Symmetry: C4
């Protein structure tokens, strides 16, 4: 109809209720489910769907051998109905590639897929299910993007990309697209020293992205974008409640403009809702691996370097595998506010479970409630032994 | 379009004709059919569909082992086209949880799924395929609901929930929802002493629910709701034709306001159409287990404590497994009256057939005819031996 | 929109071109294809689909054992996209039963399914995907119907049923339905002595049905219906080119009002287009079994007792299995005339191929061309050996 | 809505970006994927889809044995969503046959399938999913057509057919259809000496077809059609960069009106975009077999007999199997020009990989970019060893 505009603020998050879960690996043990990773959730005005990067093979198929690898010519961004698994028969390919993002602007959807060898990748921007724009690698070192949904405001849908090293300074750019065409792009600015896989959401005409400093920081870099002025700033979450993984143990004081040191060259896609006292951070429970998952209310996390949790909710037990996590919201729901939501990728297989030769995942997602709901834990649920 | 209003009375039930049957277990022996239980049927203005609580695995899948258990994080309310089986590829997830209800109000559908551990469950009310309201457990003991469709009148869709013990007095509430938001709730009143899994239908602006007294009664509690005044009453079916299971043998006189004693702490979801002389009761044939199924015309059952059958029809032979049964009607059909319909859950597997490690079911449903039709029996039809 | 009216005459049939083929048994050897029989084809104003009576099991499934039997509680009328196979995932159940018919009147579709034990069957008439009318068995001996599409004219859709013996006189009725309700019914009249499985088509406000005299005739009975006056007549195809199976060898002179003797108590559903010189008959090649299939132009077959073929076309080689055949046309196509079409059921399995324990079929269908096209033969194509 | 008219010229081709890839053989190793060959891509105003000639069996099915053969009664033109594989459950049959073409005219689609024995084939033209016209074989020697999409302009959709020898002069015709009816047909004229499988595209009211001279030429014949005057001309691509396969090595000078000699009686469906300096040719890398695939910019190829490449892009490595290739464009995209696109058929199985008894393929397709994008290679990706 008309372009959606971020006119509401966030609903108060007092707890998280279950939204979707596909139990993909469980079901896929005996049905035609595609091997995936790097999933996310994204809504259209009339439907919300699961998204992920297929590996071009089923979990039980012999070609599932080797799916731990990230970039091949057999990957593609696919979407399928909420809470269903990604099967060969219900998955809709949005585009071909090994890195992506996607978002609906109110009129139609923009999907971006990047493909290519490490030194010659290229992004192709799709709008209304048609290829419209292409961007060639600028640093010739794995051009890559969010791996979660982008956000639009009056037709402008900014997207963060990084090209260059993952263990040293790199070339991050913020592209502002409208109808799949480039309106403008900026280099990254602010104090964030390295950006990877930004998780974004929008409220009151401002887009907030919590990303991953793969180089030095265990605290998360944040990129706040103004989609009208088409400008942005960058810093880190000030809070000592560190949310990357692997990471050191929490200090009593965090860092606002530098990576918090302790772990180099590694991390995990993650997210947060930074909204004054209505601030919640997601993180793996384990400081060593992608194990477990919890949400912690840390009032003023973004700007208070001594902020510690005041409430929390466990999502996945530390005795269960987790993985990537990102934000999305249904900007077309009824009501006066935007209900924050997120998904957690539950990785199964390699490298942690090497008795199988594949790597895949299932998805669990939650959204906020103004009630103070009881909590449950949501594991993947598959028994690796069955796949042997 | 506009909210549907219960303006018609029931059509005269002179017999039952076959409506739908999915032969799920038969077909699922060699195809991707999800393991389910607690099924039901529910209509939209333009389509009637089968519903059930999937177990997040196929019947032939190795994860089918253990599906006798009721509540896990892998369950979800799913719906699929009438008479098809619930397959991985045609099942649409309505929400995540191990207890549910769903109904269309004329404009759109409301689905409710409850999930959580025993002492911390929570219900989330979905409307127009979006999460709108959440209710936390009030007795901290398996918050649960109907397991069959709710009914709406002018936007108000009442739903009965129970929280607390299943073998002692509990906390039952009647929630009146409109567009997924709570208009009001009451505590249970009347003479029913315990309520579980209400089966409901509506006619002439009154909603009747036949439920399950799991604690002491073998006769069924009935909750009649006024969706305009948003008030209700409760009693038991007066008739000596006892309809719960397990149950004692039929007496010559029933009880109108107390459970009929003889069997404690057990039962089965069931239903009835209470309409003066046009009154029909459904019950398993066996007084000991969920075996067989029949419909009996017992004029004035609800209010006559000596009422005995005047006509009847066998649905499932006592030499075949049955299970839950509930009511639904197509409130958007043509004609001057509402055609009563019901479904019977045909449980296969555990606990009665323990040579297999799973528990699932198929569905058979009938609707009334003003003709006096010949009868046939409708078993599940699968040979357990094939699954060994 | 508005009720379709049979306003056109038939196009001239100079040959037959391929229309649809699903290769169901071939494909089903390694995919989830339902076991079927008694197929047909039927069009809506915007789509033409294949129809058949599923057996409630896949061909490879263990429950495929025993599918030679005709009537069970696991059968249902299903429809699926043209030329696809009937799979568990694309088949749409129209109703439950072991005998059926279906037709679109221009506004919506009427489907009829009969179910029940031999002495207590009942038909239920569905309209707009809802149950509307029910008819109980009148002779208590396998109430049954066409097994191919019915035809409508201005809302009136006549259907022929038979109840009673298949090897002696029986009670055949012509029901005239409108919006799924009975407008009127007649007993069979005319000289046909026994009617089974009528194949019908309509042109210029007249409905012609070529049926099966299972009792004594090897020539085919024809029922011509006037859907406006709601009256009909009956006779046999006068032609010596006998078209039932099994049958005696062709004589030089046929019979116009009596069964042509030679074979008792057996036959096969078949059809014909009786249109003066534009008359074509379909028949198995073998006079002994359902083997092969050909179309023969026999000018004035219906009324000329010495009529012999003037042109012909082989459809299935006598070295391939055939089966039922029936008529249908797309009454919503463009043009000034109705293009005659038919389907041939290609039965595989029992009783002729007893190395397998199942019985199923695939479908091939053709429509007429005003060209004189070259011919090909269209067998099922599956290798039974593969199923062993 | 209204007939589409070829009003735009081609966009400048500076490189090729990935458009679609289905990884069919990879996925099909463990899922219900139909065996195919002779694929292509074609768009409707609201969707672009993959097309191919199914073999009426799955790749893992036992009937996959023998699929190297071209013409059987089990083949059919099917279409399925972009980048999905052709599965039994998502494939839509357009018509039955072993040779085809298809195109949307702006209002609806025309599909043509030819079937029959070698000496008696017949084409049937479908429009709006209905059979409208039939053409009988004129040379009685494998009537055949494009195997890729046709193009329309103001309702007129020309199609090239050939009937007669594949190793000697034959009878090629250009049919001009409108709404599936024949407006006119011509015999082939110009200097092309033999035509097979034309690959076409349209721009500025002119349709260009690059075909295959199976008889003597290693250079490609080109047929330029005027869909308004309904006339055409024919010649060969003048360029010494030879693009058929097998073929001799490139000379320094090509031939404009005669086949370039060196290889007789063989070839492969291929294509090109002839547009002055914006001219790009596709060809297998190997001069001996269907191995590898590249795009070469050869300014003025069609008319300059000494034209050699000025830029290029590898699509498939010479160490990977390729096959047929053809053109298509999305004539309903936004923008001022038509973005050239093509697909390459990646044949797997027989005859080159005879350890398996089948022959099938997957599809990769690209479209042009005005950017100068980095290149990647796109192989089928399946491991034959897994199928053993
Ligand atoms: C029914 O449902 C309800 C609803 O969910 C259940 O009630 C909930 O219970 C939750 C668990 O108790 C509770 O969550 C906790 O909230 C704490 C904050 O509340 C308390 O403090 C505030 C502030 O003073 C008070 O106002 C309030 O009244 C409470 O006293 C959080 O602090 C908790 O998180 C911390 O603990 C968990 C383990 O329990 C850690 O995993 C988590 O990371 C937090 O602790 C680490 O991080 C801090 C901060 O840096 C460190 O200080 C600390 O040492 C830990 O650090 C180590 O661990 C981390 C992670 O491994 C590592 O990185 C680091 O390096 C160190 O090794 C927790 O979130 C809910 O708020 C509460 N909800 C509600 C509405 O009440 C109820 O129990 C259920 N009922 C039943 C019967 O089960
Ligand atoms: C073709 O189709 C038609 C249409 O279906 C077939 O005709 C139908 O035939 C049915 C079976 O005969 C018949 O159903 C019965 O109706 C009886 C009522 O009708 C009779 O009584 C009335 C009233 O006086 C008369 O007007 C009428 O003319 C008849 O005489 C029911 O009473 C029957 O139900 C009872 O019996 C069945 C077993 O047959 C039990 O399973 C059932 O539970 C009922 O009996 C128990 O319950 C009562 C009540 O408390 C007890 O009194 C009794 O002792 C039994 O109790 C034991 O069993 C229960 C259950 O296990 C247990 O809980 C308890 O503790 C005790 O152990 C039955 O419903 C249809 O009405 C009739 N339909 C029509 C239209 O005619 C026709 O036969 C078919 N044709 C052919 C050729 O097959
Ligand atoms: C390319 O394509 C074209 C187009 O299809 C091919 O040309 C077609 O060729 C067909 C086969 O030759 C031909 O079909 C035949 O037509 C005959 C009628 O035409 C002839 O007679 C008329 C009338 O005088 C002449 O005008 C005309 O010019 C011809 O001379 C039919 O009579 C044929 O049917 C009979 O034969 C077939 C076997 O070939 C039987 O299976 C069939 O049942 C018919 O014969 C039985 O029935 C009659 C009638 O009672 C009996 O008299 C006879 O003895 C047979 O009876 C026995 O068999 C039956 C069945 O088993 C059994 O019940 C009974 O008891 C007895 O045992 C046949 O239909 C097409 O018309 C023709 N089409 C066109 C447009 O030309 C062309 O060949 C192809 N090209 C190539 C190179 O292959
Ligand atoms: C990141 O991405 C970019 C973008 O893709 C990569 O850059 C691209 O690199 C490509 C490969 O180098 C390049 O493609 C080549 O372009 C050549 C033309 O450019 C050159 O010449 C022009 C004209 O003078 C200059 O302007 C220009 O500056 C260059 O100097 C083509 O000629 C190449 O094709 C020929 O070679 C390939 C093998 O490399 C053959 O397979 C192909 O068939 C061509 O050669 C045959 O055909 C010719 C013509 O008849 C014969 O002369 C020759 O002998 C060969 O003939 C034999 O082989 C054929 C086929 O087997 C056989 O039939 C025959 O009988 C003989 O046996 C090639 O297309 C892109 O243009 C370039 N793109 C851009 C934008 O720059 C970059 O490298 C990537 N980065 C990294 C780090 O990898
Ligand atoms: C989001 O904001 C823009 C205004 O920036 C709205 O756009 C106006 O919409 C009306 C009807 O579409 C036009 O007549 C105005 O010219 C539009 N645009 C501008 C950019 O001035 C848009 O409608 C808003 N979105 C929604 C859902 O209300
Ligand atoms: C069910 O009843 C309500 C009346 O209670 C009907 O609502 C009225 O509908 C018309 C058109 O929608 C409005 O102009 C009135 O204001 C509506 N409502 C009220 C609540 O007064 C409703 O239309 C009835 N449903 C149907 C199908 O007729
Ligand atoms: C088939 O015939 C009936 C006439 O018998 C047509 O019905 C008339 O249609 C118009 C518009 O629907 C009405 O105003 C007339 O009253 C209708 N009916 C009768 C029964 O008189 C019908 O429209 C015809 N069908 C088609 C497709 O033209
Ligand atoms: C393609 O060209 C034809 C003109 O040749 C356009 O046809 C005219 O369309 C309008 C509205 O459809 C009619 O009133 C004219 O009579 C039409 N036709 C002719 C053939 O004169 C057609 O609309 C053009 N297509 C598009 C998409 O614009
Ligand atoms: C002619 C109809 N009769 C007699 C009942 C048949 O047995 C039909 O025969 C056959 C048959 O192949 O001849 C298949 C049908 N499934 C049967 N119909 C019913 C209702 O069972
Ligand atoms: C050039 C067309 N010819 C000669 C008939 C071919 O044999 C085609 O070749 C090939 C081929 O791979 O070269 C595949 C097509 N399936 C064939 N077409 C037909 C109709 O069989
Ligand atoms: Ca399988
Ligand atoms: Ca880090
Ligand atoms: Ca009880
Ligand atoms: Ca007979
Ligand atoms: Ca050649």
């Amino acid at each position: 109809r008309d372009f959606n505009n971020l006119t509401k603020g966030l609903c108060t998050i007092n707890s998280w209720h279950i939204y979707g879960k596909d139990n993909a690996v469980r079901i896929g043990e005996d049905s035609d489910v595609l091997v995936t990773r790097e999933p996310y959730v994204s809504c259209d005005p009339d439907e919300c769907r699961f998204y992920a990067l297929s590996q071009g093979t089923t979990i039980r198929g012999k070609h599932s051998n080797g799916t731990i690898h990230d970039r091949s010519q057999y990957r593609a961004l696919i979407s399928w109905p909420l809470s269903s698994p990604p099967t060969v028969y219900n998955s809709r390919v949005e585009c071909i590639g090994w890195s992506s993002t996607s978002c609906h602007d109110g009129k139609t959807r923009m999907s971006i897929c990047i493909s290519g060898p490490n030194n010659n990748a290229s992004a192709v921007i799709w709008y209304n299910r048609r290829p419209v724009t292409e961007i060639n690698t600028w640093a010739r070192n794995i051009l890559r993007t969010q791996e979660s949904e982008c956000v639009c405001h009056n037709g402008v849908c900014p997207v963060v990309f990084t090209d260059g090293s993952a263990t040293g300074p790199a070339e991050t750019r913020i592209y502002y697209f409208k109808e799949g065409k480039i309106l403008k792009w900026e280099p990254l600015a602010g104090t964030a020293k390295h950006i990877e896989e930004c998780s974004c959401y929008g409220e009151r005409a401002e887009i907030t992205c919590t990303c991953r400093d793969n180089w030095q920081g265990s605290n998360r870099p944040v990129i706040r974008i103004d989609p009208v002025a088409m400008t942005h700033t960058s810093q880190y979450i000030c809070s000592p409640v560190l949310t990357d993984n692997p990471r050191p143990n929490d200090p009593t004081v965090g860092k606002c403009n530098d990576p918090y040191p302790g772990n180099n060259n590694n991390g995990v896609k993650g997210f947060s809702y930074l909204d004054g006292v209505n601030t919640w951070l997601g993180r793996t429970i384990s400081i060593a691996s992608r194990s477990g998952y919890e949400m912690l209310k840390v009032p003023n996390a973004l700007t208070d370097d001594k902020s510690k949790p005041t409430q929390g909710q466990t999502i996945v037990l530390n005795t269960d595998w987790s993985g990537y996590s990102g934000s999305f919201m249904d900007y077309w729901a009824e009501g006066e506010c935007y209900r924050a939501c997120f998904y957690v990728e539950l990785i199964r297989g390699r490298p942690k479970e090497d008795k199988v030769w594949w790597t895949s995942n299932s998805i669990v997602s939650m959204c906020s409630s103004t009630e103070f709901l009881g909590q449950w834990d949501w594991p993947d649920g598959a028994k690796i032994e069955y796949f042997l």
